[PDB]
Every structure is written in structure tokens, then in C-alpha cells.
Curated annotation (Swiss-Prot), chains A, B:
Function: Subunit of the fusion protein that is processed upon entry into the host cell. Mediates fusion of the virion and cellular membranes by functioning as a class I viral fusion protein. Contains a viral fusion peptide that is unmasked after S2 cleavage. This cleavage can occur at the cell membrane by host TMPRSS2 or during endocytosis by host CSTL. In either case, this triggers an extensive and irreversible conformational change that leads to fusion of the viral envelope with the cellular cytoplasmic membrane, releasing viral genomic RNA into the host cell cytoplasm.
Glycosylation (residues): 35
Listed name of the protein: Spike protein S2'
């Protein structure tokens, strides 16, 4: 039910964040792309 | 006219930001260094 990012050769699940992923293109080009939520670690720092 | 950062094996121009570059030394040492503007994605998040 949940999506994670882990190193290729060892299962170690991490919360998908903007510090773990990079942005390129959009959803209309990538084949098989799935909807999820990406955590921004800067957002609750501004809110707090 | 504009400066970009791209991967060396495939042209894909990106806006020069602090998340694409690292800081080391100053302008008085590097030979051939040029003037440009480095974008900070943190600044408009604080301003807004
Ligand atoms: C992932 O989410 C996007 C955006 O919420 C979905 O794209 C929308 O899908 C609805 C229903 O199919 C359409 O009526 C809208 O026109 C779409 N909006 C956009 C921006 O294209 C997309 O369908 C979702 N993917 C899945 C499989 O749930
Ligand atoms: C890049 O910009 C810097 C700073 O704006 C320039 O530094 C100036 O250089 C002139 C001539 O050498 C000096 O007289 C000034 O004192 C410098 N100004 C400042 C604010 O330090 C620099 O010349 C520019 N480099 C290029 C390649 O034009
Ligand atoms: C994978 O293949 C199945 C066919 O068995 C298809 O229904 C599905 O959409 C495919 N998914 C992707 C991401 O290609
Ligand atoms: C590059 O070569 C030109 C000569 O065509 C010279 O004017 C310029 O100063 C040189 N720049 C560097 C960084 O070597």
C-alpha cells in the first residue's frame, strides 16, 4: 500500500522525499508511472 | 547568453542552482571562471 525508495542491492526502505528523488519531465511521458506523495522536509519547517 | 548545467554525455540544460553546484574557493584562483547568477530555491519559499 505504501511506496519507498531503497538501495538497489539491500532492502532499506526510506520515505520518498525531495532529497531522495529528482525532477525531470512530467507524467505524460514516462511509461508506467504511478501516483504517490513526495514529502518535502522544508514545508513543516516553514509552518512551525 | 544564458548559462546552464547539463550532464556531459547528453545535452539537457538545467537552471544553475545551489542544488546543482558546490562551493569551493573564490573567483581569484580559478582560471577562466565567469560571472553568472546562481538560483537559490530556498529563497522564494521563505519570501512567500
Ligand atoms: C494520478 O493523478 C492524476 C491527477 O490527479 C490523474 O489525472 C487525472 O485523472 C482524472 C481521472 O482520470 C482526469 O479526469 C483528469 O483529467 C486527470 N488530470 C490530469 C492533470 O491529467 C491520474 O488519472 C491519476 N492516475 C491514476 C491511475 O490514478
Ligand atoms: C564579475 O563581477 C565582479 C563583481 O561584480 C567584477 O569585479 C569587479 O571587477 C572590476 C575590474 O576588475 C573591479 O574594478 C571591481 O572592484 C570589481 N567589483 C566588485 C564588486 O568586486 C568582475 O570583474 C566580473 N568579472 C568579469 C569576468 O567581468
Ligand atoms: C504490465 O502488463 C500488464 C499486462 O499483463 C498491463 O495490464 C499493465 O498495464 C502493465 N503495466 C506497466 C506498468 O507496463
Ligand atoms: C582563451 O584564449 C583567448 C585567445 O583566443 C584568450 O584571449 C583568453 O584570455 C583565454 N582564456 C583563458 C581562460 O585561457
Amino acid at each position: 500500500t505504501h511506496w519507498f525508495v531503497t538501495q538497489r542491492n539491500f532492502y532499506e526502505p526510506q520515505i520518498i522525499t525531495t532529497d531522495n528523488t529528482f525532477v525531470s519531465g512530467n507524467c505524460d511521458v514516462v511509461i508506467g508511472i504511478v501516483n504517490n506523495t513526495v514529502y518535502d522536509p522544508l514545508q513543516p519547517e516553514l509552518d512551525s
